[PDB]
Design a protein around this nucleic acid. Structure first.
Length: 351
RNA sequence: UUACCAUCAACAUGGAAACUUG
RNA sequence: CAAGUUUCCAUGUUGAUGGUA
């Protein structure tokens, strides 16, 4: 099911392995040097153990891991971070990541850091909490998962899957109705860029009512198709949409209203009419069947696409391409409330 | 906001019915 | 025609508790 470099990956019994695994390579390992690490005053030797363990055994990933740019924090105050946390673009401007260990689990620290790491300075980064990783005897797996998160976050990937259906791009989305104030109804969008589902293009859509979302949807979809033609030069032919986040009550007013002028985006250019699949997820029922093939071959396709969560390798509840946009939705429509940046939409910087 | 698996507390919307006002 | 005192709940989110890790 799962592959790797120079070998296939392990498929266990209940497909959960977790305990000190990935003793082997990955798809891409760019050599990480300029990942400026910030440690606070209250976890000095803990962060020393973190760096020393990241250099040593975490499985032969192939990550050419090197000593980082070590930064030491005075305290955890607001003025301490907010002086220079733009993910450290002050002097050189040639950075990749900034890694921070934070003690106070105050959510506004996340809000400011991820806002000026997404839109004010578009940079992927990972934060570390002391109260979950601060002890040894479990350091192996959390160090491994930090390395795998960096692997996904540097524009590299962990694995892929074979696809028996030719030239397939996976369209997935998830609505986030805001329960607090404003009723944003933020809908994400994911699509595959490469043939083996390794590079992913993922947009975020921002619109106040439920009516003029469709224009931004069509703009994002023609941008995605232009990017697909740029990166592939042979146009995709299979289109499957995994719709989730709509109950039985909203099904009639959405599955018969939104999707026809979502389909109408294909009149921006000529010579195009591929096969369309739109499902529901709650259990799987289709609401648009244009591919006209057997249910078993595409139910197997959906069961395969359930299995590629690139931070949690294992079983999940709904299909994964729902959740790359779902976690993007509580990244943006809950925390950020800002339009996404151009470059990282080709990566999974939401994870 | 890690790496999900459960639980409960704090809350936001909706269903089912007694008191009672304009 | 609706506001309340509301009793049960359901639908979801935030923290914490135990963890696998």
């Amino acid at each position: 099911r799962i592959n790797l470099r120079n070998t296939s990956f392990v498929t266990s019994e209940d497909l959960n392995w977790v305990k000190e695994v990935t003793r082997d390579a990955s798809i891409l390992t760019i050599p990480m040097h300029f990942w400026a690490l910030f440690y606070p005053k209250r976890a000095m030797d803990q962060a020393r153990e973190l760096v020393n363990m990241l250099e040593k055994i975490a499985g032969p990933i192939g990550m050419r891991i090197s000593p980082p740019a070590w930064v030491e924090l005075k305290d955890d105050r607001i003025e301490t971070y907010i002086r220079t946390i733009q993910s450290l673009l002050g002097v050189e401007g040639k950075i990749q990541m900034v890694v921070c260990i934070i003690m106070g689990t105050r959510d506004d620290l996340y809000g400011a850091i991820k806002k000026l790491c997404c839109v004010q300075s578009p940079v992927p980064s990972q934060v570390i909490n002391v109260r979950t990783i601060g002890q040894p005897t479990r350091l192996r797996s959390v160090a491994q998962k930090i390395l795998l998160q960096m692997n996904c976050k540097l524009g590299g990937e962990l694995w892929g899957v074979d696809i028996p259906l030719k030239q397939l791009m996976v369209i997935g989305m998830d609505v986030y109705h805001d329960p607090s104030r404003g009723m944003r109804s933020v809908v994400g969008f994911v699509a595959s860029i490469n043939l083996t589902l390794t590079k992913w293009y993922s947009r975020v859509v921002f619109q106040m009512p439920h009516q003029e979302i469709v224009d931004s949807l069509k703009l994002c979809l023609v941008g995605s198709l232009k990017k697909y033609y740029e990166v592939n030069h042979c146009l995709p032919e299979k289109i499957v949409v995994y719709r989730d986040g709509v109950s039985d009550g909203q099904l009639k007013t959405v599955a018969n209203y939104e999707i026809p002028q979502l389909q109408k985006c294909f009149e921006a250019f000529d010579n195009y009419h591929p096969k369309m699949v739109v499902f529901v997820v709650q259990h799987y029922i289709c609401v648009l069947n244009t591919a006209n093939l057997s249910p078993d071959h595409m139910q197997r396709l959906t069961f395969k696409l359930c299995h590629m969560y690139w931070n949690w390798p294992g079983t999940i509840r709904v299909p994964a391409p729902c959740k790359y946009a779902h976690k993007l939705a509580f990244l943006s429509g809950q925390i950020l409330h800002h339009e996404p940046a151009i470059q990282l939409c080709g990566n999974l910087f939401f994870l």
